[PDB]
Amino acid sequence: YLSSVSSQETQGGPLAPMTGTIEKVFVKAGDKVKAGDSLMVMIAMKMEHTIKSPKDGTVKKVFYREGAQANRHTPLVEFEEE
Amino acid sequence: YHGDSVASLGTQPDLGSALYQENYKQMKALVNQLHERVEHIKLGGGEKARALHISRGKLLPRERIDNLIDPGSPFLELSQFAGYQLYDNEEVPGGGIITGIGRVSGVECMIIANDATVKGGAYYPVTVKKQLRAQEIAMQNRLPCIYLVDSGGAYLPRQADVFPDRDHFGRTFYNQAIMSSKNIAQIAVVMGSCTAGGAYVPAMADENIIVRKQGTIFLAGPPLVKAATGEEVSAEDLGGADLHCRKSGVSDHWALDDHHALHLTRKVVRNLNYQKKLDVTIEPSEEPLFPADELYGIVGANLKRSFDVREVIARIVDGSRFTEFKAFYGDTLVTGFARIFGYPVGIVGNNGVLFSESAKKGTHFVQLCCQRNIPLLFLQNITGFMVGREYEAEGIAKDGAKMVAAVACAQVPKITLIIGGSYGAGNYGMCGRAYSPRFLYIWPNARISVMGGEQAANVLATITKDQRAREGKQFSSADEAALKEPIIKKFEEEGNPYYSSARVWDDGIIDPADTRLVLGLSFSAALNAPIEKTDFGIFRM
Amino acid sequence: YHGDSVASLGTQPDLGSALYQENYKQMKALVNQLHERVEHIKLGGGEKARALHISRGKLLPRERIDNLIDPGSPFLELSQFAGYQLYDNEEVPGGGIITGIGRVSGVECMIIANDATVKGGAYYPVTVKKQLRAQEIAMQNRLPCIYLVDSGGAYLPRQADVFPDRDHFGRTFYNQAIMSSKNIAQIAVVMGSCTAGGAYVPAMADENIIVRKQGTIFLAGPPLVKAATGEEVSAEDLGGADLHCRKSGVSDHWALDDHHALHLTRKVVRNLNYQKKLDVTIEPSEEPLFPADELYGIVGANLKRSFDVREVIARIVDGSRFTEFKAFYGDTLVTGFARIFGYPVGIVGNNGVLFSESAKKGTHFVQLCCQRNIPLLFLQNITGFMVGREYEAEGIAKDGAKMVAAVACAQVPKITLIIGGSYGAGNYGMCGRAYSPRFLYIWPNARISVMGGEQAANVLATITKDQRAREGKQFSSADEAALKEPIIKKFEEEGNPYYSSARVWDDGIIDPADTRLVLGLSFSAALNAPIEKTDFGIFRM
Amino acid sequence: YHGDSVASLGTQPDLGSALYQENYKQMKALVNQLHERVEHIKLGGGEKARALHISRGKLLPRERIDNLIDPGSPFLELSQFAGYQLYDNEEVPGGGIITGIGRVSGVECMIIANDATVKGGAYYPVTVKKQLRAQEIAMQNRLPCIYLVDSGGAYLPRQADVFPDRDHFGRTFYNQAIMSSKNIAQIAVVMGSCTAGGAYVPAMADENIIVRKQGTIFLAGSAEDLGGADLHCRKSGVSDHWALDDHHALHLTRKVVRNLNYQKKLDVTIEPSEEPLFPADELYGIVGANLKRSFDVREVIARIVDGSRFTEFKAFYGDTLVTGFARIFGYPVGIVGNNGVLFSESAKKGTHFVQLCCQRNIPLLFLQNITGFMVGREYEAEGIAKDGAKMVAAVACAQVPKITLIIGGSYGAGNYGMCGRAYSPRFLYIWPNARISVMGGEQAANVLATITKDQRAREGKQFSSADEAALKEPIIKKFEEEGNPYYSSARVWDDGIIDPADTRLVLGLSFSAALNAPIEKTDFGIFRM
Ligand SMILES: O=CCCCC[C@@H]1SC[C@@H]2NC(=O)N[C@@H]21
């Protein structure tokens, strides 16, 4: 729990903060990312939110593309099991 | 046993990132702007007025405070920007009065000194409000009040806004009488002329000190005496230290000069037979694990961008240690327990739009703090409430009201810090000025108004688009900005921190790097009064 | 000035004496019997149940307590023998629940943990009584309650003795609500399944912690949902789900495993903002001047023989220092002032049959202790079937009540230790279970009943000797033991310490060598609550 | 100004309807059964015991109470059925003790009289519990206690259930000492022999009266020489008053109460009393004896409140629960009654209502007819347990007087939320058709029919339908027997089984007694929002 490996375990995947349009996607289908790497930018009620990488795991897949409307708490990125 | 290892908040920001570079640059400019404006206010009336003031043998108002407080002790000044551009053609630096909290003879006291270099010390409408705010702070925290009296009376051209009403000049004496009845010492130091209502201040004080020749006290000034009775008498003869000290008896102590009077004041406070007692548990202080100046890059000046409030918390609490409460429920609101300079604090901060879950989570947290007598700190960065047909059907208003009602009834000391926007009912739920927080501070990037400037513009752009679509005369897009641009300008101007601070809506604009120090001083002062039991109203379940 | 030399109690026993050798041998056997029986109870349900419990990743109930309390701190377990042979064919080690007082984050707390290895954690009638006793102890001493919840619900075959009455399972939630209203923290950790009706325990708590995978909280189980609505749901999905932690909001903290949950619990207690304050004067502690194990030889196991209670006192009080009150008046009762681990204590102990003078002497002493707010310790050794027991008691009734009435109204903390017999009204006068002593302990040689076994036998031997002498059919001596032997067997069986302790009549059977330590821990816990003023009734002079 | 016209509850039932005819017939039989059983209990030990009792010059225990209370005043007896079939082969009518509330010299008092005709007045385990319940009622309502002492001591064969524990015989003296310290008068009238612990009762009383020859007091058991009125009155000094006979002692007791210098004061507003607009006996047809059928609780309310006037609170929200304000004999009351399964909305509505009554210091009346909580995956996801707990926690902390009446089923956690016995209601009564248990008999049967159907389906040996009732029939019989009102009342779980036609009178007497104590401010715990 102190090791912070737990911080990765607390949530399996990053979800959409609110229902909003996807304005930017910074990750390809297979991309190596480190914690704090921005994955997507979403505007909700004219308010910009940037999604950030939870783990250093490589990205297995992306559930949304640019211009898509993503509902609140819907998975945005799939990460390869390690 | 306190040896348990625990997790700590905060992360290292990306200093190389363009966003951090831009945010730091913008926030730094605001802080520099704030600093230089205070420097100008520091000079009061000006060189000619200051030279005249010293030529009479009197100390400058800020030098008086420096000599009054303990050597090297910090001084927490309040409402430095009162009266900033408030009046069309008159410059009133600091409102003509200097108020703050400092340590005298080891006791925290409220110091209220007239600035005689500003309009001769006349009382403008903002001057009365600033003094009344200081008295309210002193009473709520049981801080002895020291009045360095050097005043020229009320400003006649604006008498209707000074004399008559409940919160007008008359309330000043009412506050003195009430505090005296509660054993909150009232000490007046007449270091200049005081006329009409001014003469009441030394008379209403528990103990009083007057300078040998500078000080003068009289209900009616020489000009009124001549008009009423046709007699010519000097101010010293009509008032003066000797007359009051030896004949009238209004004076309790007689002082040779300003330095002597300040020395006497320190002796008076030392005889108050007061000792501070703490109701809360105390733990050794620890510095935060991250630099405070990083707040410049993290926060910036663009309210449209969002940041994690936990980053702000990580840089002000002891050791960056924070126990979050209901972390995964109502995540738009952050609540948890921490310590600042050893004091326990419950922190409530906005991290997005308020929802029904967020309001419920806040209401639960506030009850916990009140039960354990833990001071509360609010970090307002709001953008409104959730808007939707479903949310109203589920009683979002009912949930939002739950928090307004819990926050109002809480009796633990409350301090509010506006680090972002403050709009609509979100202000009330987060302990706005109307809810009597012990102190309220704002960062230089804050904005406050009934609603955001854009929302008012867009709302009107619906009403008149409707007005002409429904009426039938077409209303074009260029007609839209002849509607929207004046509204946005008005809300930007009236939501500016200086506009809010010029009037006394907050207790000051503070540099983000100074947030931890200001909070530490404020909470320390607020602990001078015992914490009472909280009585709640009906919780509309 | 505390430099005065004083006399000390106690004398060196004759180790060579045959009586001492026999008494030591008998008492030692009882202590060894007590130790090995506890060892068996320590194992709970058994190897198969324990192996299954660990196979699910859960800690054993006693390992949870070891990790919860401060490192190396003593743990005062209560009612270890609850349910010992209570039920005909079912073995319920410790009643299926472990209760005791330990230090968490430097704060004394009451810990109540279900033993899931015993009948899957089902609540037997004794289980409810043991928990209710623990809650009563926590409330009377203002000890925070920590519930390590892992339960299987009520035991249906015995529902009538669990559900309905005032002191039945429902009272558990009533106690939680009352303690919460008094600011006595209620902390629940769901470390396993919470069954129907146990889901309330997490909800009724001030702060709540639930384990990620193991914990399940549901008012209706998956089977009841399946019966009522024909719906099939996994336990994790129905309750104790991420749904309970986030969607439902019942959970305040989310824990990865048992170790994580225990770490979180320690953090929660550290944030209670509580500091212990003592109402009594304190003096440095000193060990008794005589070994404690000598109590084996002095006391023995034969209740017919008599010993000087002063010898017991000399081996438990600090420095064996004792100030006797009214030493030569009513000598069958011993009263005086002493100190245990620095705390002041007034000791009342039996030294023979109670007389009118003894009752008056006790009543006077109890008033003294209540006036000075001094805790009271009672050492019960009532005497039965003596020529002295066969005495006119009309005076004894008139004077005893005065002691029953003073003892009942006393508001100072009271602790009772039964070191011998406890029969009839003598039990009431010496602060029996009915008189709400903070704690009640018994030595392995004690006997308790309405009257001594012999007296009941002899009394019946008068009634039926009369029955047949007055009726006229002769009743012979062999007919006498067909009357007396069953009675003596019954009273011996029902007066046994294990019989008394299996039901919760006392808080545990303690080794005499541990008497000083147990008293020190108990009095220390009892001092967490402020001592109230004592209001007495009418003293029937 | 109180001249406003208002609406009234209640509707005229269809007397011709077959359902009403059947329900009336079934309920009437239960009431007749209740009446005749009480008649038998009225006789106590029996003719031989009663004849022996009178032959000694002593009054019968119930005649003593009749002479003690004010002429013609009603007497509220409690737990008439204590000990009913409780012990296998021993008949103990009323537990060997008679307890109730009556008016003495214009003051409401608790009267506790031993029945010497029943087992010579020996104390059975139920006898101690009944007395302890009476003392608890007296303390909570500040009612003076009068002990008509005629006892034979503890019942030795069952000593382990009488002597040792906290709620055992010892607690009786503890209660006397505590009430005395609170200025709640304790008066003992020794009208017979009292031995061992019995002798403490006169000694622990504030004022004491003993009969000339019948009474005897001694710690250790001729009896007159060892004890007796003369020895205690003149030499021992244990006796404060000396009485020639039972009639004289009762006359002296009335004088003692008149000198208490006590006057009743009311904390609540009072309005003139009015009878309900509908006959009470119609409750027979409306309610019946079949718990599976449902009825509108408002009909019950309309027939007990003054003028059948009722102000409903949150009528359309959480409709399975009914809450509102009314008045009984002029007293203000907040009524909470079940009208279906409890839901999240119902629990929230109840919690809101209880806070209102506590704020205004209004007594609360609960009408329990429960069938359980809503069962469903969605309801649990929405925190039904969290909502249900809100009500358990508000009800527990409420300090206004609380009275509970079980007019139907009382199962599971629904009992707790509706102020069960565990939540210290001032009084708890049950109708003759009520059922109480951890769960309904059918639910326990069906639940087991899932566990063992699973047991043998999962194990693989088939378990047939006839194997099902060899499982279900014993369970249903057990829950029916242990949920019976007489089973519940034989043990002291309630304060009595009352005829529905008497509901209004019993509530009026109970609330009047409960108002002898000042109403305290209510302190709540944390409301888990
Ligand atoms: O009204 C004109 C000025 C001179 C008369 C005013 C009189 S003097 C007595 C009284 N006190 C005042 O302050 N004003 C009036």
Ligand SMILES: O=CCCCC[C@@H]1SC[C@@H]2NC(=O)N[C@@H]21
């Ligand atoms: O009665 C047999 C089992 C299925 C029906 C029981 C219902 S479901 C709704 C209500 N809540 C309970 O716990 N039981 C009843």
